A paper describes a structure:
Contraction of φCD508 in urea reduces the tail length by just 20%, whereas most CIS tails that have been described contract to ∼50% of their extended length; the outer diameter of the sheath increases from 230 to 250 Å, and the inner diameter from 78 to 94 Å, sufficient to break contacts between gp55 sheath domain I helices and the tail tube gp56. The contracted sheath retains the arrangement of gp55 subunits in a six-stranded helix, but with a decrease in helical rise from 39 Å to 32 Å, and a concomitant increase in twist from 19 to 34°. The measured 20% reduction (48 nm) in tail length is consistent with a decrease in helical rise from 39 Å to 32 Å for 57 rings of sheath protein. In both the extended and the contracted form, the sheath ring retains integrity through its mesh network, similar to the sheath of other CISs. In helical reconstructions of the contracted tail, the tail tube cannot be resolved because of a mismatch between the helical parameters of the sheath and the tail tube. As the tail tube does not contract, the resulting mismatch in length drives the tail tube through the bottom of the baseplate. In the contracted phage tail, which lacks the packing interactions between the tail tube and the sheath, the bending stiffness (persistence length) is also significantly reduced.
Here, we reveal the extended and contracted atomic structures of an intact contractile-tailed phage (φCD508) that binds to and penetrates the protective S-layer of the Gram-positive human pathogen Clostridioides difficile. The virion can be divided into five distinct regions: the head, neck, tail, baseplate, and needle. Structures of purified φCD508 virions in both extended and contracted conformations were determined by single-particle EM of frozen-hydrated samples; the resolution ranged from 2.6 to 4.0 Å for the extended phage, and 2.9 to 4.2 Å for the contracted form.
Numbering used by the authors:
A (entry chain L): 13 to 79
B (entry chain S): 13 to 472
C (entry chain M): 317 to 472
Write the structure that this text describes.
Amino acid sequence: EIPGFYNRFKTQAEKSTNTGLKGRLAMPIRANWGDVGKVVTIKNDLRQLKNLFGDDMNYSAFKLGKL
Amino acid sequence: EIPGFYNRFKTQAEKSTNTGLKGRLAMPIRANWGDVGKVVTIKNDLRQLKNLFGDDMNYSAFKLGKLALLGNVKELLLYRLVDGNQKKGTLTLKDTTENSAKDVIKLETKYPTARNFNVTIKSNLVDSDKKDFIFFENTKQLFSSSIKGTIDEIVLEINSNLDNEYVIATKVADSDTILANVVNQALEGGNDGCTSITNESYLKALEEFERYSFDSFVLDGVADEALQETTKAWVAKNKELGKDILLFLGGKTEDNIKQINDKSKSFNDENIVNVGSSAYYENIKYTPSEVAVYIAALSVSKGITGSICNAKTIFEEVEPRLSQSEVKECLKSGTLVLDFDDGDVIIVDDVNTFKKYVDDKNEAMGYISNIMFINTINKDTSLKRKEFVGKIFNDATGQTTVICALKKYFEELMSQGIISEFNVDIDTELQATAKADEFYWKWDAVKVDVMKKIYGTGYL
Amino acid sequence: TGSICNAKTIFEEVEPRLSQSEVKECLKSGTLVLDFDDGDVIIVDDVNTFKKYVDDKNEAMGYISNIMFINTINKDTSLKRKEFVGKIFNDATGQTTVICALKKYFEELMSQGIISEFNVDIDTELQATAKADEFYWKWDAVKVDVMKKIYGTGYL
């Protein structure tokens, strides 16, 4: 680069981390909503499940995902 | 010098000083009066603003300047916006000795304008050849003078006294003849400054503003959308170029709180602050951008060692007015909105438009004070560039000197209490990969917080 | 013991004025152009016209300070010519004396910190092929660099 003193700040995840989670699980699911024909990874926030596959407890998807 | 005991007294500013001001602000302005095409710095005395840009509240210049000055900015930097047709007022004078009268003096306003600056010339009652030159604005007299009937001395006197600073006199011909009498003749031919002002004028003003350094920008108290995206891109460019400029914005008065929140969602760069609430100060309303001028001014005046989350405002009323649900909606949207928590108008919080997002750019980045802190650190560091770049040899000694200087700076910050904890060290991870002509370094810190929320529990 | 890549200039204005793209274009072209990085006029970099080419004449040769260093070494060495040429017998003693003098000079340079590492020795490859009335010698060095670029990363 050109000479100079160019800062690039990286307070991304300074101390916003916790180690209370582990493992990964497979899930065939019936769902009223969400993507079809693909294996999608869901982070442990249930909001992600609610967004990507709906919030209907009548279906295996949301109920088993919450469990 | 020659031998002797020569005193030179320096009771200039012995104890005539106070420390109640800080910060600097940028201002594109429309004005009826004042300099054009230059970025002029204004000290916080409003008399300076009144002198250099007039006292007309119909124009963005004086009104937004007064708001910024009440924001307690140390130095307010202005720029007069105009269309190319914008022009100075002018008047011409003629002799009377000759039957074929010839123009001999022309009067032109010192600054471009369209106001009714008027002039009167009459026969002097004491001396025969003298003419009494008097100047007005809508018959409100500015200055009076009397000079004999020679054109050179007349124009020299008219240009000499700064009481006649509103107008410049120039000689049209080298006559020694008696001038013609005029009575309250306006300096016509001028054009105002609100004439056909468009986005291109603001773009040119911003390009002029690229020269300087600022703590904040507010964009003339105008909420035009295309100007807002243009200024957003401009500030992003300035940030990438190492100029850390903060931007405040205010939505249109017609926008509902939902629309304001949508706009505050659209903006997500940390250097963008969207203002929703309108207000009254002297029983006169202010659009969200006009009060965005004031909130930016107050923020920069606060500087470090402060915030705005409950700073009292000068405004006597605020609207639209929000329940706690609406306030929470606006804060979640990143909108900043004033509030009437008490009999005065009070700023609700320190939020910016970015606050809609959370984790990578941390939640403190959602607050304006943290951004001001980071910009200040970047600015002081980019001041250190010239001290250290190209002047020390990259050896262990040079690296140690740089680290020691940065440590001294951060310890100065610690002494002020702004930082609760810090460490600064060489970035040995990147220093291993660093080329021989460069240096990498790392630092952690913990800015000292402020009470926004407080809770009490009682036992009896 | 210095450079020009950010030396402040006496000039109150500079033109034509360049964005980072234009600056990078000029540096890649080997052009040297002043800049207005702050309220003063500042020299952008240490580049020379050669810098367009890269590897054989190394990238440091693209910088003027390295050329000044090399010219200074050549000048001091060509000053030593008159001390050593035609005045010492090419035996092991004369070669050792020449090498010791050059080592003393380079150690003086090391004391100033200009060089981070060096070695100077007889060029035994060419000395084997050398005619009896001549001498060959070799030296490696590492000039001490200067910060042109600096990068910082922050944690809060």
